[PDB]
């Protein structure tokens, strides 16, 4: 019975997936991800589509100042109460970025989007070259809760070469 409390203080990537696919009883499905630079307007990455992703990015991503990150997801036949997403990015025991969003109610058979528009954290030159030099050591956990209970867990690692 994993909850938000268990996840919010973590200082590193999970050791392994924290639930099975069958625990996704609400059939929530992430169908699109988009990253844009808010400054120039340029879409740096978009994918339109099984719980692991490897991202092939460039150093330019680490020098951004204003970023829009969109997720798009569908929901099955059941209504979803108190849907919550917690996404955390790490490099080697350091928390780079955290996103905690309470969606609340999700309509049955819906297709929904959320774009997080945020100030990209000013990573030091030491950290930047360190993450460029070590691909896929930058990783993220995406935790999805329904009424404080973990129902879905996705993972990604990142390269900035």
């Amino acid at each position: 019975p994993i909850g938000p409390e268990d996840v919010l203080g973590l200082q590193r990537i999970t050791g392994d997936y924290l639930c099975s696919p069958e625990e996704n009883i609400y059939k929530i499905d992430f169908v699109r991800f988009k990253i844009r630079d808010m400054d120039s307007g340029t879409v740096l990455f978009e994918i339109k589509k099984g719980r692991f992703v490897r991202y092939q990015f460039t150093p330019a991503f680490l020098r951004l100042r204003q970023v829009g990150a969109t997720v798009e997801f569908t929901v099955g036949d059941k209504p979803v109460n108190n849907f919550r997403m917690i996404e955390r990015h790490y490099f080697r025991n350091q928390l780079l970025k955290s996103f905690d969003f309470h969606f609340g109610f999700c309509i049955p058979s819906s297709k929904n989007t959320c774009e997080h528009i945020y100030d990209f954290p000013p990573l030091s030159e030491e950290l930047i070259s360190e993450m460029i030099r070590h691909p896929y050591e930058t990783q993220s956990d995406s935790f999805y809760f329904v009424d404080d209970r973990l129902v879905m867990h996705n993972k990604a690692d990142y390269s900035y070469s």
Binding site: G68, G104, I107, C114, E115, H116, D119
Partner: protein
């Protein structure tokens, strides 16, 4: 949205939640993408919600666009909580639906969870030649009879951007 955030940054709770409602086809998602400086070309009817969560310097601006189709409308109530500003969008050229939209607005302004919430009414699609002017829409909906909150009607075109900043400037002044 970026500059809107900065115009609201003094808000003591450090978060503002804006709810976008109105009939299907009114222009809600178009308005949202306009505000977000996003390409407005891939827009289809919203069968769910679209959210922009703008976060800077520990301030949080959340704008919620809920689908307006008759089958989505009954779920509007599930999104009322903690709303700071209601933006109600109307297709100014769809006169046959003026009574339908007045009815929905009337209901919203009786809702317990929306009591005292400032309401901006966007008389949208003013770029269309047959669009009713804002003053006429205001008369038709009896906006002058609103007792329990601050309100404003603003002529706009979500397509062209005209009138949008004036609407959002009123929003910023009235958070």
């Amino acid at each position: 949205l970026l500059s809107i955030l900065r115009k609201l940054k003094s808000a003591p709770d450090q978060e503002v939640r804006i709810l976008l409602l109105g009939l299907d086809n009114a222009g809600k998602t178009t308005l949202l993408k306009q505000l977000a400086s996003e390409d407005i070309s891939h827009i289809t009817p919203t069968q769910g919600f679209n959210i922009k969560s703008v976060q800077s310097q520990g301030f949080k601006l959340n704008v919620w666009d809920i689908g307006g189709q008759r089958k989505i409308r009954p779920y509007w109530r599930s999104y009322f909580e903690n709303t700071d500003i209601l933006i109600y969008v109307i297709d100014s050229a769809d006169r046959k639906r003026f009574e339908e939209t007045g009815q929905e607005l009337t209901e919203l302004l009786e809702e317990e969870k929306l009591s005292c919430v400032p309401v901006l009414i966007f008389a949208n699609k003013q770029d269309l030649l047959t669009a009713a002017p804002a003053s006429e829409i205001a008369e038709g909906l009896n906006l002058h009879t609103i007792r329990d909150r601050v309100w404003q009607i603003q002529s706009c075109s979500a397509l062209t951007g005209e009138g949008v900043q004036d609407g959002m400037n009123w929003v910023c002044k009235n958070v």
